[PDB]
Structures are given as C-alpha cells and as structure tokens.
Ligand binder design. Structure first.
Ligand SMILES: O=C(CCC(=O)NCCc1ccc(Cl)c(Cl)c1)NCCCCn1cnc2c(Br)c(Br)c(Br)c(Br)c21
Ligand SMILES: [Cl-]
Length: 328
C-alpha cells in the first residue's frame, strides 16, 4: 500500500498524547474579554469575526464554532496547539468559551487580508515566487508535524501585502497522517481536490496538499483561476484529464489498483497529455519561466507519491531568486 515519502513515521515516534486528539482536554478561557467588531466570514461549522481584546486593546480574529462537533473541535484545537510557532501557520492565541452557553471559539492573531481587486494583477513574478515560498514553509512545517491540511486553496491563505505576511488558516479539515490509514475522500474544495480524492482512493497523504498547491501555482502563473474548473466532482477529474492525459490517468489507477467509478467511462473521453507551454499567451507570459513550468510539472502529477514534497519544491530553482534576496 501507498506511504508518504517523508514524515511517515513521525506520529508513531511521538508520545500518543501528541496525536490522540480525542483524549485532549483544552483549557477554555473567557470569551467575555473579547468585543466582536465585524463579521469576516462564515462556513458550515463556524463564523469568523474581527474582534478586540478589551483588556489590552489587541485586535484579533474570533472563530465561533458550532458546539456539537466535539471530536472535530478537539482535532482542530490539538492540531493548532501542535503547530504553535510554526512558520506562517495562523497563530492560535487562545481557546475560549462563552462562560454561560459554553459555546467554544478560537482566537487567532489578526492579519490584514489584502483585498486583491484586480484578480491578482498587482503581483509580480517575484511576488508570486515569494508568497509561494512562504506558503511552502507552512506546508513543510505542518507535514513535518505529522499533519495534512486537506483544504489548501486561495481562500485559506491570508496575505497582508503591506507587510508581506502570509498565514495558512482554517485547520478544521486537517488530520494526522498515520501510514496505511484510509481517510475520507470528502475533503478539500472542488477545484483543489487531487485526483486521488476524485477516484475514491483513501490511502492518501501530505502529497494531497501539494496537488492543491500546484493548482494555485498554475492559476497564479497562467491567470486562469481556478485552473481546473470542474462543474461537479466528476467533471473535476475530466478537467484534469484534459491536461494530464487519459492514458496517463489509467496508468496511475493501475499502479495503485484503484477501481474507477464506471460513470467516468461516459465522460472522460480520450485526451493526450498537454505541454504546459500551451497555457502561455500575451496575458501571462511575464509570469511564466522554464523554472516555473518545470516546478509545476512536478507538482501536478497524478501519482501522489511522485509529486514533490513541500521541501523539494522549496529547493527548486524557481525559488532561487527568493532565497538569494532573503540573504543578500
Ligand atoms: O480573502 C481571502 C483570501 C483570498 C486570497 O486571495 N488570498 C491570497 C491567495 C494567494 C495569492 C497569491 C499567492 Cl502567490 C499565494 Cl501563495 C496565495 N479569504 C477569505 C477570508 C475569510 C475570512 N476569514 C476566515 N477566517 C479568517 C481568519 Br482565521 C483570519 Br486571521 C482572517 Br484576517 C480572516 Br479575513 C479570516
Ligand atoms: Cl478522514
């Protein structure tokens, strides 16, 4: 069976308490120290507000959780605690409850979420390299901590383009990696789902996040956002196969003994693998380089186990200008 190439044993080498989130007992502080100022977003299991800590005037973000998901709350809390101090991971300041209702909430550091008003037109080639490198630091960190994010997408990446700060948010779908464990494929968001999810392959790993990363890189350098625009989960795989090829998909399935839902036979068609240069034109040529294409080609691979790790991606020549500026 399939196994991560990196970080495969790291949870088993740690104390059980590190990964046994069901046994975790958070310490719940007092939400009454926080004044909600403005709604920032809302999801199936939470709602997010900008807030002030009235005791010290600190601006923060409060994610109020639907309380019935007790196991899922412990999971997210323990993951965030394990990731404390990780580079470019959103900082969990505290875990609090309304002291009367006991509804739990998470308090995060505030970030300026730049409102990109022109579909990222303002970001240069160097900016894309710089922020991709920052995002990869977060993914290498969490993977090294035995955790898969499982919902990497633009919505979950805060960038303060004033201060050049990046944070990976929303750890509510994240999960500990244990070799040979079969995971639920109902994770990630449609456009960022790896082929393994779309073909119902449960034995996936950190490399799922690297597919999502690759989708983001393709959309940044080519300016087609999202890059793979499925109308539903079936069509999502078709959109991928139109680029990566159908014979190539079947070789992946064969390698891992993956059964394909037969509804796909009526919609996949026959598609030759496309050269990445096909996506270049006058509107994106300034963001595309041989290095970018080589990196992308090594991320957007069917075979999860052969995709670059976050560290291998960071070590690619595409990021040499960032590293050199980071030291010069
Ligand atoms: O608008 C966004 C981000 C959109 C966006 O384009 N990104 C940048 C993506 C990007 C772009 C270029 C590159 Cl090259 C790279 Cl790598 C990545 N997402 C919706 C916000 C939801 C509100 N929301 C929820 N939870 C929050 C938390 Br927690 C905090 Br803290 C804060 Br602040 C906010 Br706001 C929170
Ligand atoms: Cl799962």
């Amino acid at each position: 069976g399939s196994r991560a190439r990196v970080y495969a044993e790291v949870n088993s080498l740690r104390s059980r308490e590190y990964w046994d989130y069901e046994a975790h007992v958070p310490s719940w502080g007092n939400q009454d120290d926080y004044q909600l100022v403005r709604k920032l977003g809302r999801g199936k299991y939470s709602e997010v507000f900008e807030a002030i800590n009235i005791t010290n005037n600190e601006r923060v973000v409060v994610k109020i959780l639907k309380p019935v998901k007790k196991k899922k709350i412990k999971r997210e809390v323990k993951i965030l605690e394990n990731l404390r101090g990780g580079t470019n991971i959103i900082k969990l300041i505290d875990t609090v409850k309304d002291p009367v209702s006991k509804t739990p909430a998470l308090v995060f550091e505030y970030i300026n979420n730049t409102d990109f008003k022109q579909l990222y037109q303002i970001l240069t080639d160097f900016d894309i390299r710089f922020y991709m490198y920052e995002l990869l630091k977060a993914l290498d960190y969490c993977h090294s901590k035995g955790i898969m994010h499982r919902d990497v997408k633009p919505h979950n990446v805060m960038i303060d383009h004033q201060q050049k700060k990046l944070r990976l948010i929303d750890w509510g779908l994240a999960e500990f990696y244990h070799p040979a464990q079969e995971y639920n494929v109902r994770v990630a968001s449609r456009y960022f789902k790896g082929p393994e999810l779309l073909v119902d392959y449960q034995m996936y790993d950190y490399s799922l996040d690297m597919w999502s990363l690759g989708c983001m890189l393709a959309s940044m350098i080519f300016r087609r956002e999202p890059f793979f625009h499925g109308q539903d989960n079936y069509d999502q795989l078709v959109r991928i196969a139109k680029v990566l090829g159908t014979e190539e998909l079947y070789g992946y399935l064969k390698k891992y003994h993956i059964d394909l839902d037969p509804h796909f036979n009526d919609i996949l068609g026959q598609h030759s693998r496309k050269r990445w240069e096909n996506f270049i034109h006058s509107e994106n040529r300034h963001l595309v380089s041989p290095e970018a294409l080589d990196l992308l080609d090594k991320l957007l691979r069917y075979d999860h186990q052969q995709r670059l790790t976050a560290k291998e991606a960071m070590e690619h020549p595409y990021f040499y200008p960032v590293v050199k500026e980071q030291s010069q």
